[PDB]
């Protein structure tokens, strides 16, 4: 391939892993706090300080199994609530899709857009009902990553969708959104 393609596949891979990390990280029940740095490291993806947790990295790499989102093939992070009685109910289906339409006019602009999209993700994850719920933990919150084939009927009738945002790239445009109860 052309260098843009390796750089882009890498960018989408680490954007997806960082997305899983931010979504799961906004449901532990405690506050997240990272420090800015003018002398960065080689591991501050998207110029954001997002500390990976190895377990979530492992579940995300196993769900992705070493491939990228594409047409009809979207990465999903499902957040559910399990009570003492055992009732399981999905609360959120976060969806990372890859649309068909390519952007020919558009290397680092996509990188910058994905950084912005991660900042939007940070913001949106806290203004969902499941956030206030996850901060007060009785019950326990659960996460699960999969690579569908996305379907939402586990969120019952009448769920609303928040579109975190989209980013056009020459292989396709990425859409990040959340379907919640």
């Amino acid at each position: 391939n052309s260098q843009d393609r390796k750089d882009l596949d890498k960018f989408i891979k680490f954007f997806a892993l960082k997305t899983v990390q931010v979504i799961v990280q906004a449901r532990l029940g405690e506050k997240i706090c990272t420090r800015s740095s003018s002398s960065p490291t080689g591991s501050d993806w998207f110029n954001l300080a997002i500390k990976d947790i190895p377990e979530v990295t492992h579940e995300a790499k196993k769900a992705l199994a070493g491939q990228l989102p594409a047409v009809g093939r979207s990465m999903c992070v499902e957040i559910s609530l399990k009570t003492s009685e055992g009732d399981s109910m999905e609360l959120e289906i976060w969806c990372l899709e890859m649309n068909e339409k390519c952007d020919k006019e558009i290397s680092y602009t996509v990188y910058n857009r994905l950084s912005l999209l991660l900042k939007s993700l940070l913001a949106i994850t806290r203004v969902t009902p499941a956030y206030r719920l996850s901060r007060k933990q009785e019950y326990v919150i659960l996460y699960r990553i999969y690579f569908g084939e996305v379907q939402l009927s586990g969120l019952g009738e009448g769920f609303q969708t928040v579109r975190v945002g989209t980013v056009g790239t020459p292989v396709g445009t990425i859409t990040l959104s959340c379907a919640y109860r």
Binding site: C33, S38, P40, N47, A49, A123, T128
Partner: protein
């Protein structure tokens, strides 16, 4: 690069004026900033890393994310404090608003000083309500948080529908696009002002037709 404007509106108790404002500004400023640029003589530059943190509100049932710069936070808390002082001492009107405007600096030939061109402005209008009971207080702490949720949502959604941003500067142009005075963050050149307004009425025409 004609300017784009967005108008938000919120109804809160006086106690929660600051946090509410802090929630909106910081949200916008999280999208309208990046890491500090360090330029090399060759013209390239490296970009530093932005931290973010959670802010639990004490007078609202709400949490928001802000850049981890404490200079920026102290600045915005100060101008919002000016807004709260003016609002309290304005008395009966209680109709205040704050504007956060992003602009570029464009060099003019002498003697004209450089012209500041807005490319995007955010105005949020504050409606302050007086509470009598402790119960109204407790319900207000919840409902205001629920409203700020949809405020942040709409800020993000609009942030995607705005396709224009200034183009990356060179080492000499940087201070015409970015505020480079902070240690932990590099905001776009911004400007926060506020304004106390007198409330006006509503026309009757189509409301007749509706009746």
């Amino acid at each position: 690069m004609n300017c784009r404007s967005e108008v938000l509106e919120v109804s809160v108790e006086g106690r929660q004026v600051e946090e509410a404002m802090l929630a909106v500004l910081h949200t916008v400023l999280l999208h309208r900033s990046t890491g500090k640029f360090h330029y090399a003589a060759a013209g390239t530059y490296s970009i530093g890393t932005v931290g973010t943190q959670d802010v639990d509100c004490d007078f609202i049932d709400f949490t928001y994310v802000r850049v981890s710069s404490e200079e920026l936070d102290r600045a915005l808390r100060k101008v919002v404090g000016e807004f709260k002082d003016a609002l309290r001492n304005s008395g009966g009107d209680g109709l205040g608003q704050m504007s956060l405007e992003f602009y570029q600096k464009k060099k003019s030939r002498w003697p004209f000083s450089d012209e500041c061109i807005p490319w995007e402005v955010w105005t949020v209008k504050v409606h302050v309500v007086a509470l009598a009971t402790e119960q109204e207080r407790q319900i207000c702490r919840e409902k205001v948080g629920e409203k700020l949720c949809e405020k942040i949502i709409n800020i993000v959604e609009v942030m995607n529908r705005h396709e224009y941003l200034p183009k990356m500067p060179t080492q000499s142009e940087v201070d015409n696009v970015f505020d480079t005075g902070l240690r932990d963050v590099q905001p776009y050149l911004y400007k926060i002002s506020f304004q106390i307004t007198d409330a006006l009425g509503t026309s009757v025409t189509t409301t007749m037709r509706r009746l």
